[PDB]
Design a protein around this ligand. Sequence first.
Ligand code: MDB
Ligand code: ZN
Length: 185
Amino acid sequence: MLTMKDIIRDGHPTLRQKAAELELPLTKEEKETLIAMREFLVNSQDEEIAKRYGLRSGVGLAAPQINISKRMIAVLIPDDGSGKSYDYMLVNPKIVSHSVQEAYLPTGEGCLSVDDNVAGLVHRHNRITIKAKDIEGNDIQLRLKGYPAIVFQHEIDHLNGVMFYDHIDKDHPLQPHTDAVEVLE
Ligand SMILES: COc1ccccc1NC(=O)N[C@H](C(=O)N(CC(=O)NO)CC1CCCC1)C(C)(C)C
Ligand SMILES: [Zn+2]
């Protein structure tokens, strides 16, 4: 069972590396890693389990964050009220197209690997299309908008050694870009 002790902290070199593409099919250990990454998110969203094991309630995890430099991510976003929910383990995900229009969470972002909050807006594409493989090497193409687009972009950033605060404007951290969509979750 993965817990917070498996999550490496900002400053760790692995978080600034470019993660390696996976060869398909995944090895057994790679599948078990990806499943455990998802399971961490599941456990983190269980009030009782999360309390028992001191887990921060998570919606996404990238392999680099558990010190594994491989292009694998898990995303687990519960129903936003509209019946839309996202439960995906992706291999070699790639944003293949996106909107010009930007979107941002009004309170900024945070990260499992960053202990202290950093204030500032993180502008991302409002809409993205991702191609990826699933855990069995089958093809997945996602069209995402708003909150889940933000989450997936945050995760894919980790695969490229990019941290959320890299995007924050130092002079005007809280100034929204023109026509950027404020996203509420
Ligand atoms: C189920 O819990 C929720 C329910 C409703 C809204 C939000 C959440 N959870 C989160 O936002 N969770 C954040 C998160 O998992 N991440 C993922 C991460 O660290 N990815 O690398 C940070 C998010 C900030 C913006 C997108 C990802 C942390 C950093 C605060 C733990
Ligand atoms: Zn993160």
